[PDB]
Design a protein around this ligand. Sequence first.
Ligand SMILES: [Mg+2]
Ligand SMILES: [Mg+2]
Ligand SMILES: [Mg+2]
Ligand SMILES: [Mg+2]
Ligand SMILES: [Mg+2]
Ligand SMILES: [Mg+2]
Ligand SMILES: [Mg+2]
Ligand SMILES: [Mg+2]
Lengths: 185, 181
Amino acid sequence: PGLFLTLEGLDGSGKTTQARRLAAFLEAQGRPVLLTREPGGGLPEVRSLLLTQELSPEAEYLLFSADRAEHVRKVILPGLAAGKVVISDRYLDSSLAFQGYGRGLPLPWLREVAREATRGLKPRLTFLLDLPPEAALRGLEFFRRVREGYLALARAEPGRFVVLDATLPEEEIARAIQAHLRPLL
Amino acid sequence: PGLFLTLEGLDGSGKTTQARRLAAFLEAQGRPVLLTREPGGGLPEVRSLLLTQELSPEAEYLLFSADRAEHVRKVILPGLAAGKVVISDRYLDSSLAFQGYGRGLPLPWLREVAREATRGLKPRLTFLLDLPPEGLEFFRRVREGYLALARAEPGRFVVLDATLPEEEIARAIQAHLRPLL
Ligand SMILES: [Mg+2]
Ligand SMILES: [Mg+2]
Ligand SMILES: [Mg+2]
Ligand SMILES: [Mg+2]
Ligand SMILES: [Mg+2]
Ligand SMILES: [Mg+2]
Ligand SMILES: [Mg+2]
Ligand SMILES: [Mg+2]
């Protein structure tokens, strides 16, 4: 038991919708599931703080890392230990795309920080809902750096990333996630 | 140039009292000074997050580091660039002693996190007010941890007996500084 999955992409890429549909799919199959998300699954106040405040990228990354540290320890690892499929809407790859490719932080430092923040926990599969910023349902150069950063991450770890066309019908996307998922159960 | 100084120790060691007196002493010597402190110097709200019940040592450190990162960029480096004496009541060594020696986090990771957080900025001198720790086992660890950090960097740390009268401590800080004036 225990299966750790994540969803990634730009805000408005369909992640919550696809996390919900994946939950329901797994509920329909009798498989215990836990939905969670970042930011805020570890330290809710990190999410609400950063709604109205803009910090250096380093400080932003470090707040998200503290939230992720609590999130992994109090939510994700306990859920996995109970044998659940734990699905996180955003995880480490979010910081790497947004604070790294987006705001310019060096990836090897981000990962060194993450190593103890996440206790080395990595998803078995990560679904990237890929689209241009203009297609997001909810400046443009920044968001394009993020989109490309995600695609770069996916190219480096083709054993973990599944890249999906986020502009396809939500049902069609969900059925694609289910086919990629079927061999792992 | 600008001069970066820190004060360290357990809570109740007098390090805040000495930070305040040093600032006034330099400020009455005409030298422009910036008095600041951690936690709160970079992200004043960090104080709320740090009080979270059952916070993991990793998360606690990462919170202090977030404040520290903002502190260095927005307050300390600009102060130093203006040629001020910048005095910080607590800096990185507080995390090394409390979250490393106290809560058990590995020092090399703490330092690697710190290297971008702080942008490598080290105090020229750090005044450690050494107070006997009287849970107690945790404060013994922290107290001894601080002494170990001082032993490792004997040019940077000035270890002072925190039970001496306050004005004697102030005079001993002043004497260590006079060669940088
Ligand atoms: Mg991920
Ligand atoms: Mg992290
Ligand atoms: Mg730090
Ligand atoms: Mg210090
Ligand atoms: Mg500090
Ligand atoms: Mg190191
Ligand atoms: Mg001590
Ligand atoms: Mg040292």
